């Protein structure tokens, strides 16, 4: 999506996390702005010595390369549950003799 999402100065609307106090779980979501505290001292809501703001924005500029350009990614997770099924693709149909 370089011709769609890239913006001069970087698309600051698409961000991501660089550090977290623990590893996420499968399909987990965490949008907290808590400061990553590494040392025993308190961060007091501001970064610095042994403290870091975990979220940063992407540098999606139009001059990016194949390894840095934006890519609209979608993941399709399926679930085989005891409950009944709901959706499968079209079945073939032909003429009537």
């Amino acid at each position: 999506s370089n011709n769609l999402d890239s913006k001069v100065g970087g698309n600051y609307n698409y961000r991501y996390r660089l550090f977290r106090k623990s590893n996420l779980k499968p399909f987990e979501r965490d949008i907290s702005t808590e400061i990553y505290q590494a040392g025993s001292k308190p961060c007091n809501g501001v970064e610095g010595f042994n403290c870091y703001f975990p979220l940063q924005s992407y540098g999606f500029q139009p001059t990016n390369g194949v390894g840095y350009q934006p890519y609209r990614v979608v993941v399709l997770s399926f679930e085989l549950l005891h409950a009944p099924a709901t959706v499968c693709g079209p079945k073939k149909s032909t003429n009537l003799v």
Binding site: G10, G48, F49, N50, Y52, G59, T63, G65, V66, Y68
Partner: protein
Amino acid sequence: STIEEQAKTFLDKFNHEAEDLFYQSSLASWNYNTNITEENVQNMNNAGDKWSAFLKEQSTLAQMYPLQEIQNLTVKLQLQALQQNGSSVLSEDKSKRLNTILNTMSTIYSTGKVCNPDNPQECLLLEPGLNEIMANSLDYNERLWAWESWRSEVGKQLRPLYEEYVVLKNEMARANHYEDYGDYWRGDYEVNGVDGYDYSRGQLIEDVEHTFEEIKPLYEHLHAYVRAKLMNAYPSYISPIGCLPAHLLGDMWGRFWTNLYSLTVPFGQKPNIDVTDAMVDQAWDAQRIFKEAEKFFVSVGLPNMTQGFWENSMLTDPGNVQKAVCHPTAWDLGKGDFRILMCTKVTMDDFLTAHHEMGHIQYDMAYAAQPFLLRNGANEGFHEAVGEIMSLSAATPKHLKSIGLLSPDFQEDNETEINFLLKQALTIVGTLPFTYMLEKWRWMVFKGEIPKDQWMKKWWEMKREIVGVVEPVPHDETYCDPASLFHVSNDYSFIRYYTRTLYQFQFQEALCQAAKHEGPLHKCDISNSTEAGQKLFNMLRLGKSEPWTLALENVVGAKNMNVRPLLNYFEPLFTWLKDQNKNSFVGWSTDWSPYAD
């Protein structure tokens, strides 16, 4: 938890922010060089000043993480770049005075000129005027007037400015835990904290001294060859056993003998390799020269270029209204965006220049995945040396005959190769001791071994001893010759030329072995050898994340500079120089001067 997370987290914060900021200055420089205007130069300077301020603000947290107990080489190398203050150690008065000295020294160097005693109304500027006099003109008086008046008009004016530059810089380096600004330049190859690969700053002085003695057997024979040839043109001034005058070297600084090829032809009756007509006859253009040059890089096994590389590059000067810089320069705009600026013409001179700039990209593109602070070269030698080995192999007639430029009926003989081989030695062999001469002199000046008044006395002494060159007119203590050099007045390191030269043949011997090549290296051609490019890319991808000695240990077979691949390159040349020097004296005599009586 531990302190290690602070450096690992802080460097990631810097590598994220400094990445886009550095690119904003790089693309602004691209926009300026592509369209020289008043608006772009401001965007170039505003961007560079912005990023430069970001480096100093980030040094506050860099110094709060001592590297004493840290064994991680990645964390050590990255923080050491920002932990150092540099020119910030002195007050603004000393820093501003230093910038005024360099700006004043650079202006006096650029604005130098010389007119004849008989024609004062036509004074020729440094470029292109006086450069042609030392390069093209063969007149004894024009070359002498351009040399002596340059030393008097420009050399004397740059003598006093060079004092505060040495004094102010020594105070800067000493505050940063160095012995002098000479040792500050030697710190580029510094390696600490690695077993079997550590490198002290003072080891560079021993390497150039050792290798110079190994270059002397090849240099003393070529110097006698050049003296014997120049003596035929100037017999009333050059002795068959004496020294070569300084104003007959080929330039206004005494660095290369490339301009003396016309006066030192080995065989002026035999032909040489030149595909300037083959490309014009084959309807080649600036794009096809670059495109066919890429086929050499992909054939050896190196990565190919992207579509953004070729689509956005410059091939010609877009008119005088938007005049661009036609100088060859490989650009790293960032985020995988790589480009080259060049006003290419259909000629063999630009054919090899294309491989040189394309070789620079292969250096930067290899370690592009490293961190931002580590996305750079390990030293100055690895940057420019890798570009020459690719162009030299392309200059070999084996590659030209394969591509179809040089016809296959061209005869190759030892008499013809000496023409191309000795022409190269005038550039290489006629430059190796001159850089060792200059940097040895400059290194002593920063340390303070040579007094400020004895600059010209010790400089002239080193010229007779190391290179065997003498001035055309004697100079007193008020002169300062080496300060008139571009690299000296603009605060640049010239030792990289010596290191790049010996590293060039070292990498060539490594890739020629990767090509399964036999014989001397002058006939080497790595074309269509997939293992050749693969061996190089394994080294280029390191960047500055590992020791530079490690890259040489497993590639070229040594940890420092060596003259072994130089002699193998110029192996038959030593025999040729031996025969022609039968009626001359190998070496030189320091007792002879052109103004002797």
